[PDB]
Subunit: 485 residues, 4 copies
Amino acid sequence: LTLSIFDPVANYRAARIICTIGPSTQSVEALKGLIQSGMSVARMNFSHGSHEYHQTTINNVRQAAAELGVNIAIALDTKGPEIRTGQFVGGDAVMERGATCYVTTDPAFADKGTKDKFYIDYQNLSKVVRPGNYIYIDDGILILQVQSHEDEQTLECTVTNSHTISDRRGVNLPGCDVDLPAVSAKDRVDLQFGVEQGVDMIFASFIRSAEQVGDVRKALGPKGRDIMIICKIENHQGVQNIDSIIEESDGIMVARGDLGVEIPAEKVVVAQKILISKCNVAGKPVICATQMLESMTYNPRPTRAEVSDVANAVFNGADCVMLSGETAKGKYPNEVVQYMARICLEAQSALNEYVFFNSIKKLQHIPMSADEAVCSSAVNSVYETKAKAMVVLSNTGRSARLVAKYRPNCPIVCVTTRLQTCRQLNITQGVESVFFDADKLGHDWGKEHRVAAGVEFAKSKGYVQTGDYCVVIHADNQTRILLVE
Amino acid sequence: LTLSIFDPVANYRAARIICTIGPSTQSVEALKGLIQSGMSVARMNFSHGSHEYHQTTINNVRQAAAELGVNIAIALDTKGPEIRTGQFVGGDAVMERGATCYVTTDPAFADKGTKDKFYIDYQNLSKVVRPGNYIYIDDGILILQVQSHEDEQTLECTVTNSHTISDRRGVNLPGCDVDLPAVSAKDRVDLQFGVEQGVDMIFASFIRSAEQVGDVRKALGPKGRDIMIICKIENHQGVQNIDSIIEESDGIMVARGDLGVEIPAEKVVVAQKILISKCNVAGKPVICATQMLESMTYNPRPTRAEVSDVANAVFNGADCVMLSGETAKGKYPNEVVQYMARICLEAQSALNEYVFFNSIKKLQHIPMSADEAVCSSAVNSVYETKAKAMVVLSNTGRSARLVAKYRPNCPIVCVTTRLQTCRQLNITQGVESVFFDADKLGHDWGKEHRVAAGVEFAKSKGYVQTGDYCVVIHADNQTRILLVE
Amino acid sequence: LTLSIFDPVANYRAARIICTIGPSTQSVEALKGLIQSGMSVARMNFSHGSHEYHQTTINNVRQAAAELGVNIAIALDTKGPEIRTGQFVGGDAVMERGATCYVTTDPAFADKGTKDKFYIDYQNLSKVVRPGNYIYIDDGILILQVQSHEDEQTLECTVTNSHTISDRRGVNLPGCDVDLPAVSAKDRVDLQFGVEQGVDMIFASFIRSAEQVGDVRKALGPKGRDIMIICKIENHQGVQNIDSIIEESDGIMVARGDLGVEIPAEKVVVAQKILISKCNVAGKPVICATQMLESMTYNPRPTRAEVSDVANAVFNGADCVMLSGETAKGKYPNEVVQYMARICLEAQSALNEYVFFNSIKKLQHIPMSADEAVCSSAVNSVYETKAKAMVVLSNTGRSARLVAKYRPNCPIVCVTTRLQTCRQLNITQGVESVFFDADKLGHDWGKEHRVAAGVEFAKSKGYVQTGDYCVVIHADNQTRILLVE
Amino acid sequence: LTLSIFDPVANYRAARIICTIGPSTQSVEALKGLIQSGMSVARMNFSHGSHEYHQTTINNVRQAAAELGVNIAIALDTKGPEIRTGQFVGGDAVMERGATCYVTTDPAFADKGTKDKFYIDYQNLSKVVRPGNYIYIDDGILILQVQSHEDEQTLECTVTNSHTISDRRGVNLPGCDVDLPAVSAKDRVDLQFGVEQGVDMIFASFIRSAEQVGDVRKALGPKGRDIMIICKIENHQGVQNIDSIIEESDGIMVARGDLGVEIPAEKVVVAQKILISKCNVAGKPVICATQMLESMTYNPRPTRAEVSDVANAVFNGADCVMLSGETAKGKYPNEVVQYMARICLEAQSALNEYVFFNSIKKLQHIPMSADEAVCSSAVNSVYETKAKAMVVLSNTGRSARLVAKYRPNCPIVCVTTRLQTCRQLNITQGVESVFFDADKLGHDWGKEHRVAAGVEFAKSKGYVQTGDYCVVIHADNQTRILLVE
């Protein structure tokens, strides 16, 4: 099975890079550097910083993008309802294996935390937890066991294993009945902002059921109905309910570290593998959020261990990689994005599509909807004609997504009148936007001009020469195989 | 493999019936009876009857068809260059196993033939054959062996096996170098007639090489370029060169009896099977010319042995059955065609197409031509949408053929401005014509009206109700999945 | 799918011939002629002739076989419980479409039957049937409709369609509640005889349920437990309950004619096809009892229509053909069996086994029994080693059957101490017996000698030369790949 | 494709651990700790240490193994002919991007090396290299460019990129004609030792052609004919000639780092993937030598990045992992081997074998040898019977290897009279040895006792209870499916 080689990998078919903006990269000029290095999506991290701060980024991103004549997606990454620790006096708190320590629901200790007594923001912890229970902190790396109630606000605990933990970390309480909301009050206000400022997508945190996804859309409301929702799978319950979450969302974001208590470290790879196959079949994008290339926060060149780490992530099927602190607070923002790009390009080698397409087709429920039947059939035509680019006229972009789903061995070029659609398509691998100005240009029930606009593009990008074939779609339902002029 | 049932088989998907016109059926009224019983094609047999006779049939067929408001194809079945015997004094000649007899190239004995001395129309036989050689007569059923030259015109022969033979029978001479023309002088004049009288297809006789097919088209000339050529495979050399003959012709006609010397009786089934698969893959029609239901030349009801004979022929994959003497000189012309119809319908049972289509697709040479890629992809869309009829706008009909090739599980409805195309489509299983009057109707670069004309038809024939899907093609290259109104 | 050729077909892999003994062939000398022509099984037809008559055949068969030094199976073909007509004064009765006629349950008319009034042996017919019901006679070819009761013994009827019927024909009464026994009183006495005279197999008639098969074995009793039961499928109910009947019997016998009312003539082929696939998967033999080559009852040479008839029957997958009147009362008994043999040989051409074996393997229920797992695995080894004969040591022969089931591309040679097993293996295609005299020879827990006895045989029959591989089995569980000496 | 889960993974089917002995682990007691933690193979690294040192290890390993009553393989890992640097005055040499430096073939500088002038042991370097050429040092991480000859012994060079390098590192010279021997003089003497001291396998270094493998065996000679040769693929030429090297060796060892110049860092994963599939098909073991878990040289607990690193390595198909400095000179030798074991166990999850076996079978050249045909067929029997352990009687162990090749879903238990075979089987995944004392026990042409010895084992290890099936082999050719008592 598969006798691969090491040669082509053309410029398209590379994975997509999401950059987290921070002090290192908020400037218009730094953002121009990011865009030029390979940024497709600017990610805002709403667990930190005021609305004024994020307002600035939105402005800067838009200005940088406009200056470079490109469309870059802005993404609101929510804080989420997950229970967190307070902050600590030092840079952190140092936990020791034998030690006993205290945990409080008293707001007084939120800004005062220490290795001996610190704060947890779940104001009802005392009522839910019982002596003998395990409190898992910081991706369940540090484990505490509850000994007794010191008072109606404080719990006596033992440190199960040595580990050093920093400010505001995730607390997990399995074996405790905790019905946390789908959306926190802070999320509710942040989502209003997102809607009002015209963001492209929400990276929803701590989703564990499909029902909770609907809650997020209900918060976004009628005005936010065109905003995509990408779901973070972070604990066991999310993994448990993935099937329902996938086909009820617009994508999935997963992180090797941040997968929760009940998945042991060694079976984390297994889950990554499964979740990627599960998304690839359903045709929705999977964002690899695990932080590789961490050394490049202080170093201009990475390590071959980190290179192989990204390679595997890519080679396995990830469509998007996401950079955190490296772009947000790191020393070499541009150099990081440039290596990602090269690795996302060069580590795509064996990625099959010829029989890979026919496998996804066999796994969809017949009878499929008319527009989906169109798109797959079109991909079919590409392999049959052995050529060579695709032109899709799509307003909401749904048709471009549907085609990508059936992974053709040629570039997909979407032609759109919605500027939002240009941006939102960044997180779809192997698809490129061509904006057609519905106002300034005008007429095209032809639909002459905008098709030619696609072919004009593909030609200039070096995809199609005179004599090549090109497959065209106008679905909601039309298909055409076109000889290049 | 295949757990079949016995239930549906709707009206389409039945094989097509070709009727040989003769004294019993030349009348306009009898032809109306044939059309109503199930005739798709009137076949003229040019080995008999003057041009005046065949002129009459052509006229009658056209008048019968017009009166019933239908399009029936007229087919010229050539005599061919195969060497034949003379005629005999009795009804026949009775050959006896021990006997010695004489064979002449002297025209004097052509109308005088007898069991003891008869005529062969190969004026050069004496020069080619050597003592010890076998002369095979009447489908190689009677075998003679040459003993000596009696003179420069007559050969002394032994009867190898007892058999009774009638007038003008086929002579085969393997182990003798005989370069017979692709086309006889009589064929040359008959083909002019065919062209001048606007026939739909030639049933070319004794084709043994692809090169000979080109000779037939050269005879038909520029005016006859739209006339289809169906090739008769009758001897070993044809079977040997089938691959080349198939994809260089418009179809193949084969007869269990008439397959020649070098294929033993028991390995005749094997050949039938092979030739049918070979055509079905190349997408061209195969006409089963073997005469089943012979008893119905004198009887109103057939025998269950003959019923099972046709069944097998159909169930194996034949697209057309052909009736000879039963329609031409038989007592019950209508009743024969009616049983064929019922058997061609009811014996179609298990005929798969779901994975059968995907097998033919896998066997075509990539990269296929744009119009072929379109048609297969369209068939693909039918199964994906699970519905329900096809509308193809085709001028020469090539596109309808290409779709049939990929055997969809729905009826194909062709819309055409060429009246010739209506006729020529009779020999394609599962395809129906809708004539669109280019002159009287007029405008349709829309191409609004004629598409609706197809859907109008499919609706009335009971294929498509409100809510069903229908797949549409305008290839040479367009495809559309359409919701029924 | 399948690009066949016309070349090999070695002597094994031919289908097996069953001959019906009658006046033409009861003599020891005629039976020697049959054996030499290709008879594997002598069939006795217990619907005719006294026990003394059948006693003679049994004796003659055994004497002929012993003289020629071979083992020929004797088969008791039961009369069965199906309702039959009486006999008629003439040679027959001539039924006419308009006519009215009378049917009696009065024994007085059993030997007196006529076109106007005749007898039916169901002594309760009057109580079961209602005016308007259809009586189907002679394979449902002649159809009557009941008009009224003439008396408590006679029914007034109309002839629905013209047909001529002879003595003692099958009556079918669907739409009438008739619980006929699994076994008639005459069957009960005949089966005792069968057991007492050491027959090899029963051809059980009119089986319509698996439960009825058990009734047949119950009649045969403890002494008859090694006698195989072959089930005749003759009506709709048998076809309905086939799955259960197949895996509860030792084989199936089917006849194109004799399939019953509810299967129309054209859908008879469909059933043949299904039943053959159904048996081939379950690995049990299917006997084609339909009478082809009927003309050879009076003629030394058959017709190419009959040749193609047998060809199809064979090419489709039949393992046994059965001759009736042709061997029993025909003019040319030997010549018939000789043509069958040649057709069964030469019409085997394309019969695949390479991927055909792997399809049957995929369709068996895992986990299979140890001995079955052994046999299939052994067949697997043959293809892997590309050689070349199989030696199976089997006492009851079960292991030889199991191997045949997985259709290897080499001859199977069974070595057995049971002389009954030699005979019973005649109805298994591609398997040959080697008798090993347990008494006279003796020792072989080796199991040295008897394995060598198999290899000795295969070598002499021209299967294996020095250097070839040969696969050996002793299952109930052992397998060995052996280099030839 | 593949809807995995996270549950079973029983104790067998885990990958195998190879430990490099050094100061931390040479003691008998430390070796007992290694064996108990999961060591299957002690690896000696002959690029360091005198023969006396390695003599000690051999003794200690054997004593530790005997005390624990187990068989542990000893492996000689050769130094190899690859060109190396000298050593440096400091701990290392620090190379700087702009700098110019000098390289000498003068032995005087071998023990004196510095960042400005150091030594290379290729005494002919001056004659081969030309100005402008690139010298690649330390896995081609540091790159130099030749400027000129300073003298007949020294080259002037520029440092292409900053990197710090330590003692005696690998030098690669592509674009230079260097015919290095297959075996160095030091290798020649070391291989004599290996033979004389009864090692189990050689880990041959710097093999780039199949022809060179034969040279290694020629060095080992008649006495060393039972010693397995595992080939290190370290440069492009090895990768180029892999097909020939694989089926001409006894295994392959590969290291993510140590793959050479011409494979860029990002396309290293691609090669790993290919080489593992290539070995798995040919059925030979692949040793992953890349150093994961490096942090555990100084830390008791690893990092989840290293855990995921091993996971991928395992999950991809590696049969053996190899530990270097961690066991040789590390602080926590036991704890390292214990984590490997847990990761090699728990990260095996999805590893399919049901259809995975049938894919390897389809890719072997028919006709296969009798003994190979036996083994695959036996594996076939396991799935068919759904049970449950395998017992293989094998003298050289070849048969156990052949069975493993066809990856059964049950444990394989080999029974052997050769104590060397016990050891050598450690590097085969999923196979376990049972030693049968040919001298002390004695008789078994039965072959009763030793089969029972296998079943005795499987029962005690908890594989087989009363009622389970067990498949048995004595190939060179016998197979048996056995019910457990």
